[PDB]
Ligand binder design. Sequence first.
Ligand SMILES: CCc1nc(N)nc(N)c1-c1ccc(NCc2cc(F)cc(F)c2)cc1
Lengths: 332, 338, 332, 338, 332, 338
Amino acid sequence: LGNTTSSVILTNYMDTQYYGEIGIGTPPQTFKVVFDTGSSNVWVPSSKCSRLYTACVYHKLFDASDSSSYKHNGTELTLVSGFLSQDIITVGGITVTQMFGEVTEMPALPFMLAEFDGVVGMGFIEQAIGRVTPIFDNIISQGVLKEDVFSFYYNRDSENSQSLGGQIVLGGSDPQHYEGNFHYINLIKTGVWQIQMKGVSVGSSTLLCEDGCLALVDTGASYISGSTSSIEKLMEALGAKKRLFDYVVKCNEGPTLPDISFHLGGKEYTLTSADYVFQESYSSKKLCTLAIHAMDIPPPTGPTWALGATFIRKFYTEFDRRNNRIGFALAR
Amino acid sequence: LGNTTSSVILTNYMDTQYYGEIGIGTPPQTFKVVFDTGSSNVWVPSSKCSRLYTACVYHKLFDASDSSSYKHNGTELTLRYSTGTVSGFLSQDIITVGGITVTQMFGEVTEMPALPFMLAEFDGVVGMGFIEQAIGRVTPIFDNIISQGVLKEDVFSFYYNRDSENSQSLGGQIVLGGSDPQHYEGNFHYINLIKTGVWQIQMKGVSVGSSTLLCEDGCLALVDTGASYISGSTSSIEKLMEALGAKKRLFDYVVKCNEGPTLPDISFHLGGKEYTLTSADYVFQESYSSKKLCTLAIHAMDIPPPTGPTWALGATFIRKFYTEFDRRNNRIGFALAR
Amino acid sequence: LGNTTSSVILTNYMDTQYYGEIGIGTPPQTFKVVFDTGSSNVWVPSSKCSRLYTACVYHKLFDASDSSSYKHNGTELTLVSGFLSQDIITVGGITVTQMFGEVTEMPALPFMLAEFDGVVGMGFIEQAIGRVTPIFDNIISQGVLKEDVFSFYYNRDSENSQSLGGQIVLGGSDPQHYEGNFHYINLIKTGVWQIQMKGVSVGSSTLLCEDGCLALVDTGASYISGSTSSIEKLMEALGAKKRLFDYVVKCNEGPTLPDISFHLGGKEYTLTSADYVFQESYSSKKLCTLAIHAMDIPPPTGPTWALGATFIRKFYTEFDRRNNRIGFALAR
Amino acid sequence: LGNTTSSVILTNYMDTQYYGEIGIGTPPQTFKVVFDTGSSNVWVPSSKCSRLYTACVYHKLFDASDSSSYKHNGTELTLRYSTGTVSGFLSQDIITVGGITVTQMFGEVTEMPALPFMLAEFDGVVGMGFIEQAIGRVTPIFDNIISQGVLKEDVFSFYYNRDSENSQSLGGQIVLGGSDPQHYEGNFHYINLIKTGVWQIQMKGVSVGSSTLLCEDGCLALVDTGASYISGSTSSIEKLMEALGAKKRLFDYVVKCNEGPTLPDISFHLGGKEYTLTSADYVFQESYSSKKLCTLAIHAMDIPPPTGPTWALGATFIRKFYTEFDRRNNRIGFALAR
Amino acid sequence: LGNTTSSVILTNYMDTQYYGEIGIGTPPQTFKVVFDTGSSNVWVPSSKCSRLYTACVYHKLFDASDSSSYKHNGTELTLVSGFLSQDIITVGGITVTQMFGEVTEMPALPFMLAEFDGVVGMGFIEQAIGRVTPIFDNIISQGVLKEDVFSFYYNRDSENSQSLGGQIVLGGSDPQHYEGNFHYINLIKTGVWQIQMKGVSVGSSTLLCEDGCLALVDTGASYISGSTSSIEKLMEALGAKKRLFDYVVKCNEGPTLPDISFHLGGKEYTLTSADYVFQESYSSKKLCTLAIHAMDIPPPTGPTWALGATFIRKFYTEFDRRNNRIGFALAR
Amino acid sequence: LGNTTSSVILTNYMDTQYYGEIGIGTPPQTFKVVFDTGSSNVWVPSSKCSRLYTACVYHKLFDASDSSSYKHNGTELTLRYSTGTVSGFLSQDIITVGGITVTQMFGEVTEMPALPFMLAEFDGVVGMGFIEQAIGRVTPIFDNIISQGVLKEDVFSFYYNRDSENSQSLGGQIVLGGSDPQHYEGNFHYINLIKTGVWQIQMKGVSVGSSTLLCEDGCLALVDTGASYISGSTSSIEKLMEALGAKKRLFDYVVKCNEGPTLPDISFHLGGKEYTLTSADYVFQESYSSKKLCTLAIHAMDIPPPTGPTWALGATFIRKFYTEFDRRNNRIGFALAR
Ligand SMILES: CCc1nc(N)nc(N)c1-c1ccc(NCc2cc(F)cc(F)c2)cc1
């Protein structure tokens, strides 16, 4: 451990994508990336990614020939698909030699939707493709960070202000963006940012996850998600119905929807309807969507709930690698 | 050189005006002022300003007749900025900036045009430029502070925050006599001034996405804490905006708001480092509708000689890069803001 | 009878809620209330209403200890639920001693949706809970009102003007807000503001209420409503279909929808599509909701149609207690 | 005291300017004027106003050279309002207000700042304040009308309507010599003037929702028919707006439009009665979107001594409470408007 | 052939209606008309059209008594329904004696939706009601037009500019509104602006119109249309589903939808998703409609695809009567 | 009469300002100018304009001290337009318009009001009116060009395009010495001037939908290429707008945007032809929402004698009808623009 932290300011796109800048190479080629606890690899699109893929026409491409610190590897990789490479990556004034995927195959679904170019995986080496050492582990190895933790702040989106979209801090947490103190929940096992959940209650009753369930704390996921069956039951409880792609409520009835609490480590983490309905409107004549979706995550990680941006906006989150635990604090 | 550093807390008005408080006179009369590296004079509105100037009805006015430490001068002066002009006369009084007290000559402005000054949240200006550019050859405030031998270094630094809906966010901060490591990370990278007298450096190029399409043979960059935007010459900005697909309006350029998030990066090559802004850094993203127009924080501004033709790096740039102005070594440093 | 009238200016919220100010107590504690011909009691939320109910966290609460004219009663009341109390109520410069409910139980549905605090029931003593003398009867008893009638004006909502939301006049009507002359329909029986309807026609045919039906003229109802089966048939005739909560038409086709006429007292009361579709938009790419809804009102009052705000916006309405009749006039 | 009352029909422009017609000269030249209890002078724009004042291009101008009843004076005068200043010279002519004809001294304004006067639908102002506050000690119009002994009472009354899309709505009404019972209900409740010379009364408190958080130890309220808004001192309004969750902008405070309808009541304790406005009374509710900002009809205004520091009760207040100004008894009456 | 062209500037209403001005009579009475290759008659509403029809209350009516060049015919006509008449019609500085229908019966569906008054049919005499000589044939007969062709430009709608809605050129084409050169497809037969289509492909596959189909190039149609079954299959391929009246996609997924290509005369005419989705919004929380609809056009003309405004906005269109062919060029 | 015609390409700013380029001096100083049949003087901003005039900070300024062909005059002049005034002094220099070079007297403007000129994309004005209306009796530019005997006809013509998002659209075009048949179709129809000295013709009526409700007994129409809108007297426009259901605002009339497309035609009876505009021709249709207000390109403007009372036919009209101004025959021609 050293005495430094490193932060990266994040752009908030529509409350569904949060991404910041990294540089790859000498000199740095700068990319927008999501910092994703749900995966363990760093990857960006390659200059060799065909224009067949419209995804690779609209994103920043890494040109290895323009970097003097680039070292070839070539090992194939299926994260998207491409090959392994080594270079110097700059993340908020920290520079680290890192192995990353140069993606040469990139289908239009989903990464046409991506306002970002790549992903910096903040998960464990256990889930890394090619057992590549993740970037946080490589930065830990430098012995410069104050603590072996990293933290996420995700802001609510505003049309009336050019405020910060969010912030990741490597090596600590930023007290300007939470209140009170952290309470922690231990990981079920190392290798996955997943914790036991003791119940999910809707207002005045625990209707869900009685007898316990799993919660992946996933900074790369837009929403709170559960299994199709869990969400069907949750939405039934809320009075929401599937419009056709998404679940909606009359925008005027959104403010009357009950609190949803997630029971994590002996504490109740509560979202009010303001925290989970997108009040794009408030009229009795409009429908409003919810920031909670079904997602059937297959084994071995799932079936599981995922606590994504919806949850993180409410609760400032600290990922503690020293102690294999996750800390939450309110706000702000 | 002494051992003191002083900070001034700044307010951020809509990402376009950053100002802090100074006190003038005995007892102090307080004013909201922009700290401006693109000018070298101090001025505030005067009680002698005719109230037919509506900007003088809406701002704090200095009243010499309420200050016991006031010293008359009366020399006329006119101060011309790229977006407007003020006129008045010289006075001397005691000025407090971040707990530093300094005897200072400043302009009492008696002519204050409604356009633009009715749109100014700030009252006046504290020029942080060099005496070489001071109108009336008036000694600038920082020079007068340096003369006291209290500052730890002969430098001052700027932090400009992003805007916020929260009251608890600091809009920005100027540090006199040093830099605040709480608001930057990594190392400062320095570029020497082309010449002492102007906070202006060489720029090696400007690239828009994957093309160094501008400043290909070198150009100038004024580092201007008093400028809201990045600016270039009309001809450079026409080309820049063509590349962005932006539409020109009377005072600004806009894109359709839905197109904002996918606009390309823009990089400024300064002293062997590339300084890159993404669209989120230079678009006022106030909607994602195709039916709305979103303004860019990049404008055309033909800065006349001898300072220009030049680009100016203003608040749009400084929000991303913490900036240290070094008078001792005649250089500017940039570090990644946090 | 005297020579006075008393008016109360009403706020229009979204064309669905119309409410004005009353004062309760000495000194007056001021509340937003709907003036409701569909009920017969006055009630406001109590200072003793638990914060368990989020409804009672967001509304003005009556504190009896701060009123020197307050007299305790305590008799339980199920209107919402609470207890009876007496105090002086101020309604547009008229002051009357009135018994009202202090509501201490207030569920989140519907009164979380309420922009108003309480209800002043303008119905008959026959439907009053606890057979409490309604406020209009108590004001009639003072012998100050010019006539034993009260009238309602409900304006259309505007984003481009801060115009009056509406107006209730006690003791008369305001000719500034209607044109021509009143025509009246007698109540089927005293005790309920309900009249015979002789038919409901859609453009060029009487498809509904052939052989007659009931129409409750309900200033507390947002919409024109009929039975589920009547509205199903009406909407079928219009080409509207149930989006999921509400009936909609393509906003561009709204202007082409036929007139709907309600046959009341030998006269035809006609709404054009402008009067019953909420043209929140006009594009061929948007759906627009209608201000007509199904509502199965149970016995003894129903089954019945209700003519609420949708109807009243078109037709200035006079409730005539002397003659047990209801008068309509156009506009304006 | 005579037996006549006269009414003047007022136009309501956007709930912010209420004005009626007067005629000046022979033959009459007509002007749109605000009737203003917060000032004591009459003025209209002058034909002598340089057309470099764009406000003089866009308003009706008095031309003495077309009036046979004009009497020259020429004394310079400047009239300072909280939102702007006009300057000109004194003239006398015959003025008709609601069929009352009165010989009156008024300002011919030759200096008329584009900001704010290009935003004024009205041409000039008829001050309904006391001679004590008349610039140049000019006898105010109401005094001159009282001197004729035609009015039934030495009082005048104001009705300000809500805005309307209908042409048939009366924007408002001033009654000279009495009050119109068609536009109020219940009884007048009266508060004595702190002092003759100013239409200003004691205020006992200001409460926001369930908290007398302001004016706890008493304060002043100017009843100002020339003011669009309720105003208080900057410090009072900061606290008021904190309680409402309102955001400060350059000239106003806003809330998100979706939050407008559920903002708390605001009450003003005047003379043993509470005067309560709901959010619908003080929010310009122009949408219910969370993405839009809605302006409040309550502003900060530091009214300088000797009149202030004071609150001002303007159109926002008068829309709800019909107001009678009583010169005979040096008091103001309020009754619930209808 | 002469050496003149005549153009008419068109108003664009919502990307669904394009209409310009013509004058009928001496002096001209001016009408808004759609110029429609899908029909062969000129008609406008008559002064004798009953106000029974609300369509005829909201449109310009032709008053024959106010024209000194009017000659009576009276022959009944079912296009809408009315009678034949003759007068001088002015179309962009060309004046022609023309027989047209005065429509005296005009139902509320669809022509209440019409922002235009009438139709100038640009189809062939073969489909003319009453075998009335169409207007273009009568103008050809004058021998003034440079070529026996007419061309259509339809602009995309803008809220941010008062740009031209579109343009028809009689006698030629306007190079300011296309790029490159025309390529032509021969009509299957004279008498109908209908061409063979060799396939309709969605991104990477020809799923539709394998073994060929028909394409009516219809300047009077708002959309690209095909049979109910073809569109069902197209929409399935796109991931769009029927909201209730129309097919929609999540507005955020619109940009990821594949290109649709129409194989006409050996060339591929490609629309990107930008060209066929109405991106009224771009959020993940809104639904967006497509400018492609089912339309079962009955014999003898159908079953057929119709290439309407959606197609024409992408491809500037030249209707070549000399050669019985249709030319397309990109843009602009 | 010679054999040359010259065209000047015009830029269309938002359908309200149409301007082209001229060069003044040696070497040329270029200016954006409106070509204005409603005035007879040439002016541009002057380098002598005090920079306290913010409009002079934002526009191109003529500097006589950089022109070798400049000839001093110095006679003061003031130029009054319906929407604002400028003041300055007379100068002479060489002016290039479409490759015609002409020695011309023009105004160097030193007083340039921020309202309206901060809203002007153009720098100055080239009056295309007659010498009879020239302030200071200065010979107008077209007269001076006619005197050279190079033009094919003693006429000039205007084309004003619709606005466009495309860069490749020509905003408009003036042809000196003839007309461009590429931008009109059908035949010109001509109306004689009421009198030489003013580009003003008789109008026989104005009809709104199916009612000649205005100008029933004849009236005047100024054909004014310097006017953005069609205008009439306040009283005529009140009646016109009543018929349209339009609401009056400070500077304009609006309808709800959803109602725009179905507003009735408006026709102007000029010289035995009806000139008809549809709602798409006179509504700024910027949305189809009932919640938004859409401005009409028809305004009230009381044009004082001796020219008015008169209607003015400006850009709203000219966009539809290509206009030829014929000095030889003292007439105006209209043809359908393309
Ligand atoms: C071209 C000179 C001119 N000629 C005529 N015949 N009429 C005018 N009103 C003007 C004239 C037009 C615009 C301006 N200023 C520009 C302007 C005016 C406005 F009323 C509103 C704006 F936004 C911008 C000044 C004078």
